[PDB]
């Protein structure tokens with residue numbers, strides 16, 4: 001569980017993210033597709049995009065990023081009482097996209113990386129630590145939902 005102070009740090013940095021959701025989205029996907037190459041395989045409209053400028057020029061990928069970071073953002077803003085919008089997400093990533101928790105760890109890693117890259121001044125130790133707790137909670141709860149729909153990845 002997070003303290004109110006931690007939630008404030010999470011949402012402080014997220015409002016910075018919201019100055020440019022689209023560019024953070026691109027950075028986050030490109031970083032994740034590159035540090036953990038198994039991940040880009042799940043997206044099959046994007047795997048004819050074999051270089052960074054190709055990734056950044058794809059409006060499809062960009063829209064996708066916005067969609068993703070918009071869902072994440074709405075989750076973080078509920079400060080843990082996120083069952084209602086976590087449920088549709090687990091339904092898709094568990095029974096269609098089949099994304100294991102490990103992959104959710106890898107994208108959580110990329111998010112943290114991009115946040116530190118773009119917002120050092122706003123992403124110091126306590127802020128990193130709070131964002132990690134928030135993403136950790138998200139993965140705990142989505143894992144529980146995953147199992148309720150079956151599939152223990």
Ligand code: HEM
Pocket residue numbers: 039040042043067068069071072088089092093097099103104107
């Ligand atoms: C912070 C965790 C993430 C969030 C908030 C997120 C959110 C979303 C959203 C909102 C959509 C569009 C609607 C839907 O089908 O659910 C989506 C689609 C998708 N996501 Fe995720 N996602 C997460 C992580 C992942 C990762 C780690 C994988 C890949 C390793 C992945 C792969 C997919 C795929 C394959 C689609 C379908 C794309 C389509 O054809 O539009 N997601 N995601």
Ligand SMILES: [C-]#N
Pocket residue numbers: 068
């Ligand atoms: C979803 N990425």
Ligand SMILES: [Cu+2]
Pocket residue numbers: 029043064068
């Ligand atoms: Cu994606």
